[PDB]
Design a protein around this ligand. Structure first.
Ligand SMILES: [K+]
Ligand SMILES: [K+]
Ligand SMILES: [Mg+2]
Ligand SMILES: [Mg+2]
Ligand SMILES: [Mg+2]
Lengths: 188, 438, 247
RNA sequence: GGUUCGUUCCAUGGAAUUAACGUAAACCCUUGCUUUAUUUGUAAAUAUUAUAAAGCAGUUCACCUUUAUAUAGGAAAUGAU
């Protein structure tokens, strides 16, 4: 029952007060391009630092945030609903965006990174990721052999879905997805 | 070996090396960046704009649901209250007022913020609190006493079943019916007022709002201590007062302004500018070379090797009993918390947090009423009254000369504008209201 | 615990009814010190270390009073008089009151980074114009000039633009001392020509910094900020208005 | 009565002391510079175009002139910048 004088604090807590660390890419082949967008700059710059700290723990060498060109829309409208036309005013909607590109990233590890950002996404930010991956010839046979592998991973996930025996509200399965997807996206 | 397709992406390496340059210029403090949720009602971005075009319309529908949701009341038959029927429609000022909703959107959910001024709780809590302690003290005796004579022989047991408890309970109700229905009234009306902010009743409102956004909505209800701290709640209250025919317009505006308390100020110091001088306390100027390989390499202090020793000198550390001392731990169901979480003192952090927030104090107040507000039922002319107390200026920029961040390209970040439209028996009128913060 | 039976409100400062109580209280204190230490010797102003005294604005904000410029101007003549007292003979009382009138304001420092010279002896200068940006690599040579790979004559079909692009070398009479390899982008013929003028001038100063007084009078150091004005609603152009019909 | 782009500032009045709005300040684009970032932009690169976040900068210093001694102004391709 004695008191110990801690020489320092956990590195997880110290790293929160340093600039986000970055791994070094040995080859430099891009494995993911995450483009973040928002109408504000304060939440976009904050979440980009948070996204770089996650890429460090996963061993992903991230590059950026690269400031991409601003997307500026413009509208000139009359200030009066009725006749008065010699008086108009300009409006705009500037989209601020950043790019975080990961290189030499393992395909699965890159998907945990993306899965983490979506779970802890910051409000007011839209995200889009392009993932790359190398594969061998014979894609047809590769995707048929991996069926048994994916089935085992889903054994515990089928519980999410449940329907009455011989679901009749669906009808044509494929046509249901195609039409239900449009209804979810709002038209397309 | 490797693939050719792979080698064609290695050679494309013309990157610029991070130089770690040393700053030789003096840096000022960054502007005050106001929150993002206060620029647009919907803080959102989506790549498919089909989820973006109906938001202006939904804001109207959502605000209607929230307004009517907070006005829910028991039926007179549930509380046994005798309804006093009458033709006139009574205006209720002692309810929960709510402002327009601010929604933070993600691809997974939406956080709906709404500022409320709970005026009904102020009355119910004081009214029920008048019931003195003797009520509950004596009521306990009736329980014990009743068990000695009814559920026992004349002067937990295995010969007392629920079939007897029922009769034993009805006897108490029959003798205290006029008193229980009274306590039940205020107890239920107070709990209803309480559950409106809890998940007991909010999970139902979620099902109604969730149909507009197709995402689960999380509520962030902020209770305002004064109805003057939010413009939406202010113009709403002033509008309900003016809706009565016999309402004295000018008198009602004066009573509201009298309730508004402005802080003491020195006019000569507030309107005094600021001379731009390098602040050597800023972490940017104190260390012009931010690399630890230079800071921790015995630059100024003698053996401050530990990165923690450096951080403790810059920031306020709660883990330390002495602010610039040492972090001494103790070495040899219940909640899972550190053995020192109870000793942590967030006394100076509240100062750090709340001093870094601008526009806290109420700076100025402005009310405008315009429309048909005469008392007689004829075709008179429109009225227009204006009252104000304080100013709507952005003192940080107009006087001190600091740089501000205007909202939506033209609006001052310290003012709240809200308009509420109503109508008398003779025509329509509107109540505009501005509220600024210092 | 009970209040005192006899009590009356009294002003704290004797300058209660004055225009600026706090100022006069501090001004009268100086009048008292000066009248007390007037016999001490002084030093000629030439041997008095220059001090940055506060301004009329710093006092208004500090004292929270609306001090007058004329009344403060004479209060500033005392601190300058008392400051002239001999340091060794200056009393500690005057040393303290004088420290409250010093202005410790430091202006911000923003020094441009000097243009280096590559290991191969080529310095890069950058110039700009209406919409163009130039990068000139000036190296010791014979006088060969290239613009986007093309020669100076194959690129500019107007001799006026050629002379303006290398005007810095011409004005200083060094066309035959350096070889320029320019790379321009954006803008037009004259926009790019004037952009190279500033680019070569900056690169030239990296080799011979003592030519700036000459490039000044030549007009190759100044950056011309003129820019096309946007079109404005209600106008046919930046400033041209549509026909106004009186009737 | 002076002065200022300006109810700006100074002085003054046998009556003034203050508040709000406009004004001003600040904000957006643009100009020079500093730091950060380097892809989908950059010939190369020991990083200089471009891209875009934050910060600094002017009527600031020098020169000349200067009322009531209180508040200032002028000079404009041959002082600095
Ligand atoms: K034009
Ligand atoms: K740049
Ligand atoms: Mg006057
Ligand atoms: Mg203005
Ligand atoms: Mg590339």
């Amino acid at each position: 029952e004695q008191e110990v004088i801690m020489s320092r604090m956990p590195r997880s807590l110290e790293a929160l007060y340093l600039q986000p660390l970055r791994r070094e890419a040995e080859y430099g082949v891009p494995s993911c391009d995450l483009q973040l967008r928002s109408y504000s700059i304060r939440n976009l710059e904050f979440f980009c630092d948070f996204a770089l700290r996650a890429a460090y723990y996963l061993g992903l060498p991230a590059f950026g945030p690269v400031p991409l060109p601003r997307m500026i829309e413009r509208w000139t409208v009359p200030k009066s609903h009725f006749i008065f036309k010699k008086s108009q005013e300009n409006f705009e909607r500037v989209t601020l965006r950043r790019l975080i590109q990961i290189k030499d990233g393992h395909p699965e590890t890159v998907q945990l990174w993306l899965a983490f950002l979506q779970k802890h996404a910051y409000y007011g930010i839209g995200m889009k990721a392009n993932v790359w991956e190398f594969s061998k010839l014979g894609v047809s046979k590769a995707m048929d052999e991996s069926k048994s592998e994916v089935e085992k991973l889903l054994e515990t996930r089928w519980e999410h879905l449940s329907h009455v025996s011989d679901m009749k509200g669906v009808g044509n399965f494929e046509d249901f997805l195609a039409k239900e997807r449009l209804r979810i996206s709002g038209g397309r | 070996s490797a693939s050719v397709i792979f080698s064609k992406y290695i050679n494309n390496n013309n990157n610029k090396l991070i130089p770690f340059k040393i700053k030789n210029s003096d840096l000022g403090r960054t502007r005050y960046f106001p929150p993002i949720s206060k620029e647009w009602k919907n803080s959102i971005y989506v790549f498919n704009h089909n989820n973006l075009k109906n938001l202006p319309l939904f804001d109207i529908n959502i605000n209607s649901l929230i307004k009517d949701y907070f006005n829910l009341q028991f039926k007179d038959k549930i509380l046994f209250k005798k309804k006093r029927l009458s033709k006139v429609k009574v205006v209720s000022l002692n309810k929960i007022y709510a402002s327009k909703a601010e929604i933070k959107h993600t691809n997974t959910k939406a956080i709906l913020t709404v500022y409320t001024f709970n005026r009904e709780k102020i009355s119910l809590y004081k009214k029920i609190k008048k019931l003195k302690k003797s009520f509950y003290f004596v009521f306990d005796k009736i329980i014990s006493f009743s068990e000695r004579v009814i559920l026992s022989g004349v002067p937990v047991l295995p010969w007392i079943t629920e079939s007897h408890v029922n009769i034993w309970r009805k006897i108490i109700i029959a003798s205290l019916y006029k008193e229980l229905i009274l306590l039940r009234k205020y107890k239920l009306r107070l709990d209803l007022n309480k559950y409106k902010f809890e998940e007991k009743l909010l999970y139902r409102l979620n099902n109604l709002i969730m149909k507009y956004y197709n995402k689960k909505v999380e509520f962030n209800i902020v209770n305002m201590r004064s109805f003057l701290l939010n413009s939406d709640i202010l113009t709403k209250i002033l509008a309900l007062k003016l809706k009565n025919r016999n309402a004295r317009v000018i008198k009602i505006m004066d009573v509201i302004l009298n309730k508004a308390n402005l802080p003491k100020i020195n006019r000569v110091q507030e309107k005094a500018s600021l001379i731009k001088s390098v602040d050597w306390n800023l972490l940017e100027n104190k260390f012009k070379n931010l690399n630890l390989s230079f800071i921790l390499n015995d630059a100024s202090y003698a053996e401050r090797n530990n990165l923690s020793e450096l951080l403790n000198k810059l920031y306020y550390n709660v883990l330390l009993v002495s602010q610039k001392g040492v972090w001494a731990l103790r070495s040899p169901a219940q909640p899972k918390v550190s053995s020192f979480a109870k000793a942590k003192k967030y006394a100076k952090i509240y100062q750090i947090i709340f001093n870094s927030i601008n526009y806290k104090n109420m700076g100025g107040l402005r009310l405008e009423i315009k429309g048909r507000l005469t008392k007689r039922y004829r075709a008179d002319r429109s009225l227009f009254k204006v009252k104000w107390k304080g100013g709507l200026k952005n003192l940080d920029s107009s006087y001190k000369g600091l740089s501000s961040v205007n909202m939506r390209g033209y609006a001052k970040p310290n003012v709240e504008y809200s308009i509420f439209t109503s109508k008398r028996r003779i025509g329509a009128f509107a109540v505009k209201g501005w509220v600024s913060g210092k | 615990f009970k209040l005192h039976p006899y009590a009356r409100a009294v002003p704290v400062s004797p300058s209660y009814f004055t225009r600026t109580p706090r100022f006069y209280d501090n001004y009268l204190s100086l009048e008292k010190l000066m009248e007390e230490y007037e016999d001490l010797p002084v030093i000629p102003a030439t041997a008095v270390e220059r001090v940055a005294w506060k301004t009329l604005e710093d006092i208004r904000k500090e004292l929270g009073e609306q001090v007058k410029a004329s009344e403060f101007a004479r209060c500033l003549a005392l601190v300058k008089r008392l400051n002239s007292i001999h340091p060794d003979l200056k009393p500690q009382e005057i040393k303290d009151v004088l420290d409250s009138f010093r202005r410790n304001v430091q202006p911000f420092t923003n020094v441009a980074k000097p243009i280096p010279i590559d290991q191969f002896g080529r310095a890069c200068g950058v110039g700009k114009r209406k919409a163009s940006s130039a990068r000139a690599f000036v190296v010791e040579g014979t006088g060969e000039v290239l613009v986007n790979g093309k020669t100076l004559a194959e690129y500019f079909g107007r001799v006026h633009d050629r002379e303006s692009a290398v005007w810095a070398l011409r004005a200083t009479n060094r066309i035959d001392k350096y070889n320029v390899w320019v790379k321009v982008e954006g803008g037009g013929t004259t926009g790019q020509a004037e952009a190279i003028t500033l680019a070569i001038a900056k690169a030239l100063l990296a080799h011979e910094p003592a030519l700036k007084p000459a490039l000044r009078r030549a007009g190759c150091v100044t950056r011309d900020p003129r820019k096309v004005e946007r079109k404005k609603h209600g106008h046919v152009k930046a400033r041209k208005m549509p026909t106004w019909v009186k009737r």
